[PDB]
């Protein structure tokens, strides 16, 4: 179906958290996500009248935007939902610099960052055991 | 003189910012520091009835404590003030994991991290031009 990306509202929270329960196993990130929506920091991608994925961000990573969750429903069967979320941020980031990360084991997300013009931009060790966070970087559309 | 380290109160803000004006050139971090004190996230080291240095932290670095400012007055002429601040955090961090960073060019701060049992733990590029942030890591006292 036709995708569209937009800023989430509080009406979207229960659908968003239902996605997150599929991805992480529980509703433990509900309050983080709720706070993000309260602050206008949550973006959704929709298709066929339902939410297909979501993104949260904050501006507290060395004073730059960091994309803290980039989540697609495990029901989806084609690529492009994460890309839609990222492209929205290229236009709507409150800072010129945009960072995010994923595990070194997560070759799927690495390929999404690549598909969206993000580059490797560092590493944070001593987080998940044996599986560091790889930092990704890009600049906004200008 | 005898040093002591303790949680800052709002009474300490004008002295703290006076240090920061020496270090960065202006009072641009006053609101950050003020907010830190408001939230109980600022530590001071004192000697001879005056504040000699300060530290701020937050718990929003991959859900871990990050020491966001570690600042010593440029008037001081012996080592140990930053160490005092770090040792307080080893006992008072709200998380078992403790991170911080400094520029790759900052060999003085690197030596402070070393003197306090922090290890290199990654890098973030595309911040200061040609001078990445080196991530440092340790665990709390237990």
Automatic annotation (TrEMBL), chains A, B:
Pfam families: Acetyltransf_1 (PF00583). Residues 3-142 form the N-acetyltransferase domain. One of its GO terms (molecular function) is acyltransferase activity, transferring groups other than amino-acyl groups. CDD domains: NAT_SF. This is N-acetyltransferase domain-containing protein. It comes from Bacillus cereus (strain ATCC 10987 / NRS 248).
């Amino acid at each position: 179906g036709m995708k569209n990306v937009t800023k989430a509202s509080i009406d979207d929270l229960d659908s968003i958290v239902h996605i997150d329960i599929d991805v992480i196993g529980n509703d433990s990130r509900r309050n983080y996500i709720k706070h993000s929506i309260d602050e206008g920091r949550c973006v959704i991608v929709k298709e066929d009248n339902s939410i297909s994925g979501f993104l949260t961000y904050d501006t507290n990573f060395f004073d730059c935007t960091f994309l803290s969750l980039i989540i697609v429903s495990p029901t989806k069967r084609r690529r492009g939902y994460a890309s839609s979320l990222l492209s929205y941020m290229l236009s709507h980031s409150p800072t010129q610099k945009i960072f995010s990360s994923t595990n070194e084991s997560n070759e799927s997300m690495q390929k999404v960052f690549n598909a969206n013009g993000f580059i490797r931009s560092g590493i944070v060790e001593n987080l998940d055991e044996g599986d560091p966070e790889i930092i990704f970087y890009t600049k906004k559309l200008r």
